[PDB]
Design a protein around this ligand. Structure first.
Ligand SMILES: CCCCCCCCCCCCCCCCCC(=O)OC[C@H](COP(=O)([O-])OCC(O)COP(=O)([O-])OC[C@@H](COC(=O)CCCCCCCCCCCCCCCCC)OC(=O)CCCCCCCCCCCCCCCCC)OC(=O)CCCCCCCCCCCCCCCCC
Ligand SMILES: CCCCCCCCCCCCCCCCCC(=O)OC[C@H](COP(=O)([O-])OCC[N+](C)(C)C)OC(=O)CCCCCCCCCCCCCCCCC
Lengths: 58, 93
């Protein structure tokens, strides 16, 4: 709406594009930079005692 | 023919009922823990940290896809709740 040039300038982030640097608010550290609990807090609490939360990836 | 127990064994056997009761209670406790952790997963799932990096990624790929990717790709401006009670970021900042 402001301008195609304005949008292009806003989106461009690097002068040299040969390097890929994804934007992250923070970098994972625990569990070898992984997430153990990919769930909500409620799911994390309940799934340890209630059936149906685990989807049996087989 | 007095086929009685040896004296040392007979003396030792006095405390055996306490051992039996301890085993009963301990088996009960262990079985309760096993069943509580077994029912939700239908198995005794190995701990997440007891796994290779690739194994961890493969295990959690499906959960990531079902919980984050699909809402992210089906997102609409009017899907978000106005109360700001949205799901927390996967890596909280
Ligand atoms: C009098 C007038 C009338 C009054 C009426 C009152 C009201 C009546 C009820 C009314 C409502 C009925 C509604 C029915 C329909 C809805 C049902 C529903 O929602 O469930 C569906 C829901 C899900 O549906 P589903 O997926 O199809 O279910 C299939 C299975 O879940 C699939 O299972 P799985 O293959 O995944 O295997 C796992 C499963 C398999 O695990 C099992 O449940 C099997 C048994 C495990 C071992 C139990 C060992 C017990 C003894 C240990 C040693 C104790 C010593 C110390 C005490 C002294 C003992 C003399 O275990 C679990 O899932 C985890 C449950 C853990 C239960 C906790 C331990 C139970 C014992 C508690 C002891 C308490 C301390 C001692 C008290 C002493 C008092 C003197 O099912 C369940 O979650 C089932 C839960 C079962 C819990 C155990 C129930 C008792 C089992 C028999 C043992 C009884 C011992 C009594 C001792 C007494 C001593 C005096
Ligand atoms: C002087 C009195 C002495 C009293 C001694 C009593 C000692 C304490 C005993 C505690 C253990 C009792 C276990 C009984 C079986 C419980 C089964 C169960 O909860 O189902 C789980 C099951 C687990 O099944 P699930 O995990 O598949 O549930 C999820 C189901 N979907 C996926 C569909 C959503 O849960 C349910 O059935 C759901 C409804 C639960 C409703 C709340 C249950 C509370 C039970 C309280 C029992 C209190 C007994 C008090 C007796 C007093 C006598 C005077």
């Amino acid at each position: 709406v402001h301008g195609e040039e304005y949008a292009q300038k806003m989106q461009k982030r690097f002068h040299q594009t040969d390097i890929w640097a994804p934007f992250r608010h923070r970098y994972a550290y625990m569990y070898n930079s992984s997430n153990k609990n990919v769930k909500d807090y409620k799911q994390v609490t309940l799934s340890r005692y209630i059936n149906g939360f685990d989807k049996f990836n087989v | 023919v007095n086929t009685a127990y040896p004296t040392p064994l007979k003396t030792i056997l006095k405390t055996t009922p306490a051992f039996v009761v301890y085993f009963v209670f301990g088996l009960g406790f262990s079985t309760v823990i096993y069943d509580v952790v077994y029912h939700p997963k239908d198995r005794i799932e190995r701990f997440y940290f007891r796994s290779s990096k690739f194994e961890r990624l493969s295990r959690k790929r499906d959960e990531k896809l079902r919980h984050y990717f699909k809402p992210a790709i089906e997102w609409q401006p009017w899907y978000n709740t106005s109360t700001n009670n949205n799901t927390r970021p996967l890596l909280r900042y």
